[PDB]
């Protein structure tokens, strides 16, 4: 089996303007994970990056459309990374995935950078 | 288990899978054998998981370095190319698909870092690392900088550290000597010291990473960056008038980037191993076959000599192959894992001043 397992939870439905917190539990041989990412995909659309956390620098990067509304954070003791989503918009409706990588040569903002992927959790926002 | 008498091919979703499917249509036109190309989600972990149960595709496309462990787990068949076919590909690409003495995949594409420069800011980019301090002082008087690149990953910083002699494991005649490690030798110390001195003299910032460097180059703020062909599409969108050239030399010696080889392995569970060999050797690894894939999504540089000579009319691709041939194949052995994490800490610690260069590399060799 995979040496790293990721499990998302927290999906739900929110009226526009509200908030929702997602979590991603990481387990296995996670000693060298340097990158944790949140991605999302709606039917008929390309998977897009939402937030990227660089664990060894603390740098966080956000998609332009969610910057200032979403916050990604790591609880190292629990090995759980969170996505706090504030001021939700209908355009945020998607299946949300967490992803992890030990290292990479390409952009940490892109899906192709990440080796391990969760099953996804559904977020639905209504206007 | 795997269906006999057809071919199933898995390749990642960032590759030219429509072009590959078209090569499969040509194969069917000559042989009657149906070729199905898929790009499954989570392919990196999907192939080892499904192949361990004796299932999955006949052919898997992935970077060569992961195939070493797949071969160790018994997931890949030994391939049987004759000398005449082997002569058609660059020798170093065969070394990348060699594990325990056996060839375990067909090389397809070749990637390495190059020096990317802004032609409007810097029509004649420097041939040497030693020129960068004076060039940066010039450009900073004009509100610019000379060079910004990802300092956080050893993949990006090791080419300079390797130039004067640093290396992970000695590699001679297709075998790594894991007892021969050059992380804290004199050459590695020389290269890392030059890097830290660049930071000491304010020509680079220890915090610069992939995203900071990419934004700065694509906005015309810095004259140079270091990156691979995967980054060219973003620079195209930025409309920066960029070029791609040989990495700067250090102490008169080439920078030595790691080389990744997109490769095609044959599933050990496949009952179609001879069909897969025929498809890969006689249809894909031809000028026409690689052209079909490349027209869909560019491969960058390729392992087939004949088609590389055509692609290298693009100076960006010629530079990619020149840098790759001056570099080192990314080791496919499990001992390489500790290298990335140890050297990442060492460079961070040296660049931020938490350790000296000699202390940091000593701990990394340790």
Residue numbers in the entry:
A (entry chain C): -1 to 125
B (entry chain A): 1 to 366
Quote what the paper states about this structure.
At the core of our technology are highly stable synthetic scaffolds called sybodies, which are designed to mimic the natural shape diversity of camelid nanobodies, thus allowing for an optimal surface complementarity to the limited hydrophilic epitopes on membrane proteins. In order to mimic the surface complementarity repertoire of the camelid immune system and its capacity to efficiently target membrane proteins, we designed three sybody libraries based on prototypical camelid nanobody structures representing these three binding modes. Hence, our convex sybody library is currently the only synthetic nanobody library with a long CDR3 that mimics loop tethering as found in camelid nanobodies.
Crystal structures of three convex MBP binders (Sb_MBP#1–3) in complex with MBP were solved at resolutions ranging from 1.4 to 1.9 Å. In support of this notion, SPR measurements revealed decreasing sybody binding affinities at increasing maltose concentrations. In summary, the crystallized sybodies bind to MBP in an analogous fashion as camelid nanobodies, namely via interactions predominantly mediated by CDR3 residues. In contrast, the structures of our convex sybody/MBP complexes revealed binding via the designed convex surfaces into a cleft of the target protein, thus confirming the anticipated binding mode. X-ray structures of three closely related convex sybodies in complex with MBP proved the integrity of the sybody scaffold as well as the utility of the randomized binding surface.
